[PDB]
C-alpha cells in the first residue's frame, strides 16, 4: 500500500494547493494533457485512415499480445514519428471503447498493459533520442 498512500498524499496536496490558488504540477501532467488533445485532433483529422487502422484488430478474451504487436509493428514497420505515436494511443483507445461496447470491460486493463509493454520495448528508446515527451508537448500541446 506504500505506493497507493504516496499517490493519495500527492492528490490531496495538489487539490489543496489548487484550492488556495497555487499550481503544484506533477511531472507528466503537461504530457498527459497534450496527448489527450492530440488524440482528439487525430481522430477528427484522419477519420478514414484511422478506421482502416482500427479495422485491423478486434480483441476478445482469447487474444494474445502477439496479435496486438503484429498490427502495431505495421504502424511502426519503417520507423517511429510522433504522428504514429499519437495513432498508437488513439488505436488503443478505440480497442478499449470497442471492448466496453461488447460488454468486455475486463479487457481494458489488458490493453493498457499491452500498450505499456509496447511503449517499453519499441517507443521509449526512440523517444529518448528524439527530444523526450517534452518535445512532444512543444510540438502538439
Amino acid at each position: 500500500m506504500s505506493q497507493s498512500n504516496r499517490e493519495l498524499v500527492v492528490d490531496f496536496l495538489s487539490y489543496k494547493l489548487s484550492q488556495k490558488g497555487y499550481s503544484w504540477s506533477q511531472p507528466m501532467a503537461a504530457v498527459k494533457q497534450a496527448l489527450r488533445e492530440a488524440g482528439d485532433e487525430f481522430e477528427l483529422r484522419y477519420r478514414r485512415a484511422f478506421s482502416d487502422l482500427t479495422s485491423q484488430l478486434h480483441i476478445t478474451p482469447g487474444t494474445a499480445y502477439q496479435s496486438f504487436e503484429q498490427v502495431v509493428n505495421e504502424l511502426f514497420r519503417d520507423g517511429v514519428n510522433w504522428g504514429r505515436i499519437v495513432a498508437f494511443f488513439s488505436f488503443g483507445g478505440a480497442l478499449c471503447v470497442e471492448s466496453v461496447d461488447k460488454e468486455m470491460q475486463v479487457l481494458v486493463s489488458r490493453i493498457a498493459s499491452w500498450m505499456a509493454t509496447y511503449l517499453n520495448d519499441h517507443l521509449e528508446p526512440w523517444i529518448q533520442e528524439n527530444g523526450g515527451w517534452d518535445t512532444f508537448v512543444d510540438l502538439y500541446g
Binding site: 485512415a49 519503417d78 504522428g83 504514429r84 499519437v86 495513432a87
Partner: peptide
C-alpha cells in the same frame, strides 16, 4: 517513408 496521412506533418 510516408504511408499514412499523419506522417505528412513530420
Amino acid at each position: 517513408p510516408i504511408r499514412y496521412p499523419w506522417d505528412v506533418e513530420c
